[model samples]
Target: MEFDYVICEECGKEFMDSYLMNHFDLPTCDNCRDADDKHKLITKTEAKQEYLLKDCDLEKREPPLKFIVKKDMKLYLKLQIVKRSLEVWGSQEALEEAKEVRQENREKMKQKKFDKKVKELRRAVR
Candidate 1:
């Protein structure tokens, strides 16, 4: 027996067993996977910067304004994740998942800001 099903790459929605995956793989969906990829790249860049700042001094650092914006943007995504999980799976298991996401998101935001600040100071004193 040949089993078939197509999972939408954009929204991760499974469709009819006979649906073709080729067409759906184009990132075509109302959820817009393209924008998601862009956001992920931005977040990854921030994370990389955070790792680089670990060895830098902290006493004279000042974060850039964009760092704060990115931090808030991450928090916004956390709230969105909680809202989405609650809407889909309800608050039962989503509570812990939401909490974890929120914690990591906050940490990422802080790290990103700290790293950006360190980089800015290094450039200024050069």
Candidate 2:
């Protein structure tokens, strides 16, 4: 019989049909499979949240990504997501640093809204 298998990079072993290969065209094996990290799948909202990516970064870019619709959401590969982030921010540290700025704005707005209710000593002052 023919060797109808794939030699994945991470595991250095042969595989039959990894979803990564069939779907995303990655040469990764099943043994290297895990959803939580590395080859992680991210939904549209989470992509915007963690990577602070807007539609322009994803949609307007020269090469758009292949997204799989699952559970009523568009799922993207984190690998390419990081690359897109790099395209915008230039590097990881730059993105990581700006995330604090974004988070601070959100927290600031949340606290300002509390002034109307919590300012009356219900939960103390701001």
Candidate 3:
């Protein structure tokens, strides 16, 4: 009877077993070595650096002196709503609607126009 010997697929070490020869019809232990090899391990610092740099190009930047006064507040609320909707329902239609609404709101909020309207509404309530 010819004995069978083969190299370990993972560690590249030589090994032999009589039962393996008999179980050639079955799966032999060649690549089934360690379970940990299936996953990648990385340091926390490495992960942080990777995530930070992944989209550096898209990071928010300061703009030069501008006429817009309430754009920040409008954009913030719009972004918050869109972000929450995306997280909850994953609806593309809702996201598109949110973007459109955000654009309209931002235009209305420019030069603090929305604030003036809110002031008028408050005055009417008093």
Candidate 4:
């Protein structure tokens, strides 16, 4: 007995036709299939909240400002993870570097916002 395999378009991996056909019209490996399902389980907003609660230092964060940090940090983490993955695969070094730079720029923007808010509060006091 012999089995034919098809290459998953998403992950560039080959899998049995039966497993590939069960996923969708396009052929995909099990990992890519599972990742699509996992992605659908949460909205972007919910993902950001989960990431912030799990990874962020909440002690110094103001309740209102927390959302801003969460948004920025979510983008930062996404870029970081994708960049690391590219590094591992030795692909698209320039794109990954650009993402890293964008992540740092976002951090600077967040800091600037915080400083502006603090300056406003100080002025209100005097």
Candidate 5:
């Protein structure tokens, strides 16, 4: 069967209207349809760069924090340190070291809080 020819809106090329309509939306040829499919899957950096180039004020919308430390980062660092310690030392030694480090930090923080409270009391007395 002979297909009726039609003009494509995207590429401005002439193609069979029946074939184009069967596969893609009307007015878009096969080549343009394929290109549109690929265009949807752009890289993250490419999309960001394209968006930034479009608007000069887009830079102000960026995240303010240089290093937004979350629980995930802390957990990752802790795991890495523990893994390294386990490799260098034995499992028991590594576990003991981790506990000791935690205990030391906890005690230090407790002492700091006590000192702060004492300072506040002295100020109130004065």
Candidate 6:
């Protein structure tokens, strides 16, 4: 009899389905797995704000990522999101520099308004 084998993306060794594979869609084996730190689950808002991924980028794209949403808490695997970010934003360096640029615009708007409305709010604040 033959068994189904998968090549782990981490160690490059064959493995049967693992808990992470079955539950979270990660291809790495159990021996190389961790529930925290290295492989993490990021909330939807965190994914968007930190990675600059829009909702359309998360869902409408091809091979729409697997997610586990409980109540209003939407979560995604960090590795998958990283790969998706790569697809959308090019390289990690590119994403990093782009996010750094966003930090430049960060102080301008405290958020929650559109264009001139923000200007009006800023004027009223003083």
Q: Tell me model 5's lDDT, rounded to 2 decimals.
A: 0.46
Task: Residues 40-117, candidate 5: write the lDDT tens digits.
Answer: 233323433322222222223232111113433311112223333344345756556666887799899999999999
Model 3 off-target regions past 4 Å? 1-89, 111-126
Clashing pairs in 5: none
RMSD of each: 15.7, 5.5, 20.9, 13.7, 19.2, 4.4
Per-candidate TM vs. native?
A: 0.29, 0.67, 0.22, 0.38, 0.30, 0.69
Model 1, 7-125: lDDT tens digits are 55656775543212232223234443343443222332343232222212111233211211444442112222223334444564655666577679989999999999999999999
Candidate 2 lDDT, 16-116, residue by residue in tens: 89888777667787778776888898888998889989998998896777688896999888987888989988888999999999899989998888876
Per-residue lDDT of 82 in model 3: 29
**In order, what lDDT does every prediction score?**
0.40, 0.83, 0.39, 0.47, 0.46, 0.83
**Candidate 5: count of backbone clashes, pairs at least 3 residues apart or interchain:** 0
Ranking under TM-score, best-scoring first? 6, 2, 4, 5, 1, 3
* lDDT-sorted candidate list, best first: 2, 6, 4, 5, 1, 3
**Considering only N, C-alpha and C atoms within 3 Å, which residue pairs clash in candidate 1?**
none
Count of clashing pairs, candidate 3: 0
Q: Please, what are the lDDT tens digits per residue for candidate 3 over residues 1-126? A: 223655554455556742322332222344553324432223323332322211221123221111112423211112222233344335767656666776787787785987898899999999
Q: How good is model 3 by TM-score?
A: 0.22
Q: Taking the tens digit of each residue's C-alpha lDDT, what string does model 4 give over 63-83?
A: 211112343432222322333
Report the candidate with higher lDDT, 2 versus 3. Answer: 2
Q: Worst ten-residue run, lDDT, model 2?
A: 117-126
Q: Which segments of candidate 4 are over 4 A away from where they belong?
A: 1-17, 24-91
lDDT for 50 (candidate 5)? 28
Q: Please, what are the lDDT tens digits per residue for candidate 6 over residues 50-117?
A: 89999888888887887888788988888778889999998999999999989877756646346778
Scored by Cα lDDT, where does model 3 land? 0.39
